[PDB]
């Protein structure tokens, strides 16, 4: 099953996602394109979504990189003989010779292969990894960027105030760009119909998270709406997908 989403966010004021910012410091430059103007990279979207999902799940296992307990090799063998896809992943990663069809081949195993198998087990047993992928995991979520034809860019300067005496500190003149916007359109495709994804979207509905730099300074705050945003669930490959209001899916 493939779940297709077209999310829209009514962000307060503007946002800013910088990059490179040349040299010489001075102003802060938001990343450009050259032709399309400005955009939000898909990697930033994925990072924000991973942060939101991690907040939603609140899994202690995920907090310590899934390295807090020793996984018995018997359990690993049981999962390997019980899950065909997990066995295929392990064989494709550590090698067919190392892991036979039935068994672990302890004689050929060593420290690093065992560590890799344990990490694979831990990450495969984590919903966040199963959704967003990992170093060896397939993935599960594809996020497009949000290139905006609008290029309205204003500059919001800043100054530091000496605490000992309330005046401008003549040491630097911080200058920060800001991209004013009202509706950020991002297309998201998820290949894992996870209640984690629904819960993350639900959290974004009411609380809402920040995106971009200087979020501590009122720059970048998105909130998902249930009116403009729309979704689509695909289970049959012989029918044209149908989009409907996101409220029905989320509420």
């Amino acid at each position: 099953v493939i779940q297709v989403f077209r999310l829209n966010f009514r962000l307060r004021t503007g946002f800013r996602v910088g990059g490179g910012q040349e040299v010489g410091d001075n102003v802060i430059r938001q990343l450009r394109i050259g032709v399309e103007g400005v955009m939000i990279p898909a990697s930033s979207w994925k990072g924000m979504f991973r942060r939101v999902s991690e907040i939603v799940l609140n899994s202690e296992d995920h907090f310590e990189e899934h390295s807090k307990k020793e996984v018995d090799t018997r359990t690993i063998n049981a999962l390997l003989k019980s899950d065909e896809k997990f066995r295929r992943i392990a064989i494709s990663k550590v090698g067919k010779e190392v892991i036979t069809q039935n068994g672990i081949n302890v004689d050929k195993l060593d420290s690093e292969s065992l560590s890799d198998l344990r990490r694979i087990y831990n990450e495969y047993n984590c919903p966040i990894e199963r959704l967003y992928g990992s170093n060896y995991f397939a993935g599960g979520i594809t996020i497009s960027d949000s290139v905006i034809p609008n290029a309205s860019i204003m500059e919001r300067t800043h100054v530091t105030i000496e605490r000992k005496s309330k005046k401008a500190s003549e040491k630097h003149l911080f200058s920060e760009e800001i991209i004013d916007a009202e509706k950020i359109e991002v297309k998201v495709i998820v290949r894992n119909e996870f209640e984690l994804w629904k819960n993350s979207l639900k959290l974004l509905r009411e609380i809402g998270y920040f995106i971009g730099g200087s979020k501590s300074r009122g720059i970048g705050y998105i909130v998902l709406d249930e009116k403009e945003s729309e979704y689509a669930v695909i289970n049959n490959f012989s029918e044209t997908p149908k989009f409907s209001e996101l409220k029905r899916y989320l509420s």
Partner: protein, 294 residues
């Protein structure tokens, strides 16, 4: 009959499989590979294939393999010279009892050149009797690929070659009439960019007794089957790894070392056996000079 190939793209050539990598070996395209591609296209179109088909190896347009009497004036450069109508000015005395060591005197002037038989040479200009030439250098790239089922398990690599318009001589047949573009290379279903075959004016070259420029890697005899005898052979040894059908069982990958392409051989008699042109070899011909491309 002449053919034209508007390649202008990256294609592969003779590969030297290393571990799991593949490397370009021949800067040119061998006749066998071409013939295989042109016959595969016939098979795709109809399926009825014929072994009476021969095609000369293609070379970059306005290029040719080097022979002994076409050396480079510099020991390390790439500038080649030769005398107009050299083979007519050469040979000739081969009928007479003229010492060959005296015949192959390349010291026309001081600091006599050194030849590199079997290298791609491009015609440059007239420059009185000594024609200007330049060695041909092509463009090559490396295309490495990964192996997944999402997650890597192995690795592979390839080396492609860039070519301009290509020319070759084939057999007069409806095959070229009915075939227009040919997938060529190690990976025919993966990695081709653009291929096509253009028919052009018919070519009538004569093969008879006398000194002949062996365009293909000629072979004097095989399995005792004597094809021709040569008074003096000037060239280099080559290794052949190709394809030929002997009608009945087997008939693939016969490995027999041969003469390097562009070798000069003074053949004085032939035989009427099964010609090896369809096997991609023995494409000699009488030429006045390298200007025979015209």
């Amino acid at each position: 009959i002449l053919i034209k190939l508007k390649v202008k793209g990256y294609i592969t050539t003779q590969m030297r499989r290393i571990r799991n990598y593949y490397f370009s070996i021949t800067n040119y395209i061998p006749s066998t590979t071409l013939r295989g591609a042109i016959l595969a296209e016939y098979y795709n179109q109809t399926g009825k294939i014929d072994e009476n088909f021969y095609v000369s190896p293609a070379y970059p347009i306005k290029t040719a393999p080097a022979h002994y009497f076409s050396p480079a004036k510099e020991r390390k450069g790439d500038e080649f010279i030769e005398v107009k109508r050299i083979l007519e000015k050469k040979e000739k005395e081969f009928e007479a009892n003229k010492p060959i060591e005296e015949i192959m005197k390349l010291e026309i002037d001081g600091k006599h050149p050194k030849p590199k038989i079997g290298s791609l040479i491009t015609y440059e200009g007239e420059t009185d009797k000594e024609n200007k030439y330049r060695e041909f250098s092509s463009k090559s790239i490396i295309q490495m690929h990964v192996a997944i089922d999402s997650y890597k398990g192995m690795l592979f690599a390839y080396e492609y070659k860039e070519f301009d318009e290509m020319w070759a001589i084939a057999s007069d047949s409806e095959v070229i009439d009915t075939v227009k573009r040919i997938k060529i290379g190690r990976g025919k279903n993966r990695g081709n960019k653009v291929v096509d075959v253009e028919k052009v004016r018919e070519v009538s070259l004569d093969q008879s007794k006398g000194l002949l420029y062996c365009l293909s890697p000629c072979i004097g005899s095989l399995f005792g089957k004597t094809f021709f005898k040569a008074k003096y052979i000037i060239g280099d040894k080559s290794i052949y790894s190709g394809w030929f059908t002997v009608d009945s069982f087997s008939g693939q990958k016969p490995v027999f070392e041969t003469l390097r392409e562009g070798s000069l051989v003074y053949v004085e008699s032939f035989s009427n056996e099964k010609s090896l042109m369809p096997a991609g070899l023995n494409f000699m011909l009488r030429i006045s000079d390298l200007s025979s491309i015209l």
